[PDB]
Design a protein around this ligand. Structure first.
Ligand SMILES: [Mg+2]
Ligand SMILES: [Mg+2]
Ligand SMILES: [Mg+2]
Ligand SMILES: [Mg+2]
Ligand SMILES: [Mg+2]
Ligand SMILES: [Mg+2]
Ligand SMILES: [Mg+2]
Lengths: 240, 93
RNA sequence: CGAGCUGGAGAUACGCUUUGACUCGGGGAUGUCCGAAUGGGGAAACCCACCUCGUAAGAGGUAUCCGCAAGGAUGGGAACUCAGGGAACUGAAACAUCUCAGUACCUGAAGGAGAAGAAAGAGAAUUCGAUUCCGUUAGUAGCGGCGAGCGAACCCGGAU
RNA sequence: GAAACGAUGACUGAAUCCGCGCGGACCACCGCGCAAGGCUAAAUACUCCCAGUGACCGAUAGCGCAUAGUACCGUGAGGG
RNA sequence: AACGAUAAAAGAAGUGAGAAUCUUCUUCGCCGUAAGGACAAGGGUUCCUGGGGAAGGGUCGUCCGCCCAGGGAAAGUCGGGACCUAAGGUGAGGCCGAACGGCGCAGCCGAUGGACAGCAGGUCAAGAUUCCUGCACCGAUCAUGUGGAGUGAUGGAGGGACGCAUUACGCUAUCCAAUGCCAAGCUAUGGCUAUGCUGGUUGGUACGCUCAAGGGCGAUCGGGUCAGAAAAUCUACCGGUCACAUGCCUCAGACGUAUCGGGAGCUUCCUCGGAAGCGAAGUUGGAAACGCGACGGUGCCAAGAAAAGCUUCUAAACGUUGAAACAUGAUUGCCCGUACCGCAAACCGACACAGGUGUCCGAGUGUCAAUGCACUAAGGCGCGCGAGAGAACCCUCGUUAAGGAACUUUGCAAUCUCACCCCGUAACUUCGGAAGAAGGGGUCCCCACGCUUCGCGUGGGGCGCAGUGAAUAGGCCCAGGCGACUGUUUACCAAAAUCACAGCACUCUGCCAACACGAACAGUGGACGUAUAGGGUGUGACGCCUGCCCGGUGCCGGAA
């Protein structure tokens, strides 16, 4: 049980319900996690403890850097209490060390991957997710992201050795409605159980369906929702 | 100034018997706070107040005439003086 | 002004008045608190401060936007004026262009009025000579699912 | 529309008085004007308020009121 | 027609023009986890006193929550402000927008949370942690004395700081019992003559070598600057030195002593009923919190506000000749709330309306237990028409010969069953269940003996038609459809086979994500998340499974 900030609940924007469903669940305080790790380069840290920290799905390791500054870090699958850890270019590719992709070997499994130097971790953060290094290009490294997509991440971006913790959300089977409620409000309200007024599927006389669409107009099974943007150049082979 | 503030003394059977124990009651300005009320009595009567308690009082009448009526609005201050009590000759009343 | 007055209040008491009350004109001086509201806060009319002078009482100051400053501005107006924005019912015996109509409404700015105004003009006389307003031209010329229907201007006569 | 002229959001972007704009595509000729700077009384519109008048009303009329935006209704706008 | 719940009433005495209805006495009946009592909201003088008697009061009023007049409401310590922050609101500057305006960091506003000093009694007709009496406490300013030097932000750190379930030990509030104590008298109907009957049986404070469960705590010298913007003697980290039991520190509460208080009643006067004076006893044993000791123990996953006050640090600063702190005087003590109604005749419901309304206290006997059920204390009330009669019919009830579903759309309705203990218990199954299956027996009173008690067990005896003797109080079973299950819904004709659900799938989305709100190159939600995540569609536990057709339509992919 250790220090953090309060994460007050909210399911609607500066007015009305914008992200559908979302509502119940326990109180939960926000724990500040170290995603950047750069300002602690060269300083060694000891894994004080791993902790149950909601807001995440992935475990959290309580780190103590020899200077006195205690920081929380995404605990990776394998990290134990007492195991030392360091950040920077001058840092070994060992369990829990933060080092840019240029110093990171090929085929070597990583997580907490950035996208722009500084900013912080943005890829493979959930438990069990990992990015595997494919092979260095120019001032960019090709990687295999959790989805299966290949991205050009510029070598200068930090990473953490190993796959993310919390083994597997598998034996977690919820079981009863209300385990869902311990977290988020009655989800999936069928649009076919709605009225012509309410949603496009809604209406008719009994059980049905006729054209396949979401809440508003669109269509959902197979329809490229992606834009014709810049980031497409720093990307290779999408599908799955 | 002094001489304003304390509008009138409190008449009633309870104020007259409170008098008999050196305790004086007045209808004062509803805005005239305890300290200002303390000073005004102290000066105008030439006596020291050892304690002061006060409270605001509402109104509302009509006998006849569709003139729904209206309030009046007071504040009643009740003071106790140190051992050598009495106020003027307007205490024996 | 010249004997009354003491508000409607018709009610008793106290009184005031030719050393000119009362009422009528016209200027002053007071003018709590809220309200643009303006020290800060606020569920108007309440709560809480700081500065300066001051014998305590008490008096003055503490909003933002223009500009050296002087000095100006915020808010309020029944309708009328111009501007930004701008419907539908309705009519077309249905309706979509069209109509209702740049009407209703909202919003901004302002005044006792405003707007507009001193020809890169009107129009065919090598006439006129800033603008507005009224008469008339004239339901003309023209517009128009050339349908419903819409509808000028010059000339000339006047207000100025 | 044969649709000129004004105006202008986007993109362009001239001449300087043997110059420039217009005269209902457009060209010639004839004719009327000086843009891209500003100010401006008067006649005109209205009626919160005041006065005068009326083949206007006179208490179910005339303003909603012989005075009330009250009583009363409504959470409120509002209605009365 | 009705006069607003079937919780009653009776008589006597009084008052008055007038009395079923107002007052007083004596009974009666009704509530008593309430129909008693204390708030909050809301209402606004309805409160008390004297008077009234037109309307209001479903009747009558001599009365009232009505009408008139007078009065009553007292705070340094209670609640709110002069303190703090949450959601939210606002917001100089800053980001957008035809106008009006929309956002938005710090800050500010905002309690429903944090913080913080007073307890016991007395008493107006009507106020009381507010007034009076007794004795406290808090802050500030100053006077005196001790101290003899530091004080220690707008900043740092510690602290405030927080779940759900279950539970060990001590306690108190509070409750019971008795041939404990104290007080008052008397009783007789047949008895008792007190070992009967009735009532009362200790609060505040101070001091105390007295008994005491339970709760709380490491101390100090160092090292790195790379951590807290900087500094720190503070805090974090690593290390060295004594950390078993103990050891410190605090004492819920009990006991003793003293003192102020209260205390059953007794007493004197009385303008009819109050006022004043006095004042006994303080036991032994049992029970006992949701309160207190306490931030205790254990277990669990869904992982349980912030900010100020507070404590500790240094920056700046004034300073060491007059410090901070302690101690004893004195002085000081602002504003608003405080009556009354407040599960209701004073609030919301047009109505003195069978409805609704958040919190707290809520006694005794009996009953495994209990805030259930019956009766009942304290207390409150008999519901603002009444009186007769004893028809049809209608409503709410009790019993019912013989029969027992023949009723009917349908056992609709109403019976039967009904608590606790012992015995006993089926198919089927997901191995939990089905189960309170089904069915049987016990149940009161006395005495003896045995034992873990309020008690229970064995034995013998007694009484009635009958012993959970009244009240509360499952009828059960076989088979099928649908839906797995708990759950949700049509406020006011539909509770369901609807919706949701755990689980499955297709699919989209690489992050300024897809998607969604929006004047908007604003802002925001998805998400302080990141593909073991998020959107959308469908199916709907679990088991076995999920086939054929790609022509048309849509979606993805090709391009000569
Ligand atoms: Mg008449
Ligand atoms: Mg009027
Ligand atoms: Mg905000
Ligand atoms: Mg009867
Ligand atoms: Mg007869
Ligand atoms: Mg079958
Ligand atoms: Mg079901």
């Amino acid at each position: 049980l250790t220090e953090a900030l309060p994460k007050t609940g909210g399911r609607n924007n500066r007015g009305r319900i914008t992200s559908r469903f979302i509502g119940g669940g326990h109180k939960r305080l926000y724990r500040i996690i170290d995603f950047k790790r750069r300002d602690k380069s060269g300083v060694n840290a000891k894994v004080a403890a791993i902790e149950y920290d909601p807001n995440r799905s992935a475990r959290i390791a309580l780190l103590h850097y020899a200077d006195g500054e205690k920081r929380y870090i995404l605990a990776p699958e394998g990290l134990t209490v007492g195991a030392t850890v360091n950040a920077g270019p001058e840092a070994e590719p060992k369990l829990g060390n933060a080092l840019p992709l240029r110093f990171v070997p090929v085929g070597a499994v990583v997580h907490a991957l950035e996208l722009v130097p500084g900013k912080g971790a943005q890829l493979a953060r959930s438990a069990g997710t990992s990015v595997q290094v494919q092979g260095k290009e120019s001032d960019y490294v090709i990687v295999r992201l959790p989805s299966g997509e290949l991205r050009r991440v510029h070598s200068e971006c930090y990473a953490t050795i190993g796959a993310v913790g919390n083994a597997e959300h598998k034996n977690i089977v919820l079981g009863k409605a209300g385990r869902s409620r311990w977290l988020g409000r009655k989800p999936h309200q069928r649009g076919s159980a709605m009225n012509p007024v309410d949603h496009p599927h809604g209406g008719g006389e009994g059980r049905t369906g006729a054209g396949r669409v979401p809440v508003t107009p669109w269509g959902k099974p197979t329809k490229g929702l992606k834009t014709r943007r810049k980031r497409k150049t720093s990307d290779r082979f999408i599908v799955t | 100034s002094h001489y304003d503030i304390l509008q009138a003394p409190v008449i009633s059977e309870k104020a007259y018997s409170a008098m008999e124990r050196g305790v004086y009651s007045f209808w004062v300005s509803p805005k005239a706070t305890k300290t200002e009320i303390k000073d005004a009595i102290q000066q105008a009567f030439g006596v020291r107040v050892i304690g002061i308690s006060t409270m605001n009082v509402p109104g509302k009448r009509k006998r006849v005439g569709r003139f729904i009526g209206q309030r009046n609005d007071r504040k009643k201050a009740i003071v106790r003086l140190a051992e050598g009590q009495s106020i003027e000759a307007l205490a024996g009343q």
